């Protein structure tokens, strides 16, 4: 039969989330390679069933003609895929997780941009007082009471 | 013998290159 598969990059395939899934990918490599080898080994087209004409040319053709009439009535079933829906099931959940990750990451990136902009704008420390340095960066405190230094000694 | 005389040719070639570059 005819096949319509999708080409993949295994280098990028290994980059997808491999945690607790290394064994699954290792099995998938074997299955994907071996099934392709087996498929290529045998022709997709059905074998030559032209023997019926040869049987007619064959001296023993009489009852073989009736059997050929029976042969033309033969039918071969086609298996039905079952895991196709299961694969499509997880994609929606993965897409939702990706969207949530994108939103959260973009919010964090905007916050970091704001903080970097705040850090860039800074007084040249000559006009700074002690309180404004505490404003810009955390510094000493008054937890060690009754001290003239408050350094944690 | 093959190993021992395979070892010295590198030193001799390096010293040839250094000598010729120097002058």
């Amino acid at each position: 039969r005819k096949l319509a598969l999708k080409a993949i990059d295994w280098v990028a395939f290994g980059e997808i989330i491999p945690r607790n899934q290394k064994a699954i990918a290792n099995s998938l490599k074997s299955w994907n390679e071996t099934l392709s080898t087996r498929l290529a080994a045998l022709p997709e087209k059905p074998p030559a069933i032209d023997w019926a004409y040869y049987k007619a040319t064959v001296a023993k053709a009489g009852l073989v003609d009736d059997f050929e009439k029976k042969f033309n009535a033969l039918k071969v079933p086609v298996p039905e895929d079952k895991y196709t829906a299961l694969v499509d099931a997880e994609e929606q959940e993965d897409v939702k997780r990706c969207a949530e990750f994108l939103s959260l990451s973009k919010a964090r990136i905007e916050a970091y941009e704001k903080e970097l902009e705040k850090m860039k704008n800074i007084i040249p420390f000559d006009q700074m007082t002690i309180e404004d340095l505490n404003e810009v960066f955390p510094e000493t405190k008054l937890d060690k009471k009754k001290y003239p230094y408050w350094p944690h000694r | 013998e093959e190993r021992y005389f395979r070892a010295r040719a590198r030193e001799q070639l390096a010293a040839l290159k250094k000598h010729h570059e120097n002058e």
């Binding site: 295994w10 280098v11 290792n26 490599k29 074997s30 390679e33 392709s36 080898t37 290529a40 | 093959e2 190993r3 395979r6 070892a7 590198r10």
Partner: protein
């Protein structure tokens, strides 16, 4: 015969294998790392490439490709014990997915710059993907 009757493509990759094996034999039998270790590291790989099965001859271009992979050094990292599986799987993959490339070598009778460019990418990608 002096290789008077031999395809042009095969000479390029066999004349260089002659020297590798000739230099491997004269040292690597004793009943440093700069020269000796590399020499026998290449030689043990080259010996394993020449083994073959029974009742299964190969076409010329596939031999050219499989020797081209070995001679250039693309297989100097893998353990020698697993070379044969790599040969078989790589031959099957190349036969199936790259039927147009072989015809170029068969028709031209010699390698070309474009062919040489293609083969390196194919070899590196398949080596990266083939780790099982």
């Amino acid at each position: 015969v002096g290789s008077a009757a031999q395809t042009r493509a095969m000479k390029q990759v066999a004349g260089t294998m002659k020297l590798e094996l000739a230099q491997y034999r004269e040292v690597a039998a004793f009943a440093l790392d700069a020269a000796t270790q590399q020499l026998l590291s290449r030689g043990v790989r080259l010996t394993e490439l020449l083994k073959q099965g029974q009742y299964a001859p190969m076409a010329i271009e596939e031999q050219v490709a499989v020797i081209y992979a070995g001679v250039r050094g693309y297989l100097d990292k893998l353990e020698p014990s697993k070379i044969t599986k790599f040969e078989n799987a790589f031959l099957s993959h190349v036969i199936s997915q790259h039927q147009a490339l072989l015809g170029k070598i068969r028709a031209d009778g010699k390698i070309s710059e474009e062919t040489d460019a293609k083969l390196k990418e194919i070899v590196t990608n398949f080596l990266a993907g083939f780790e099982a």
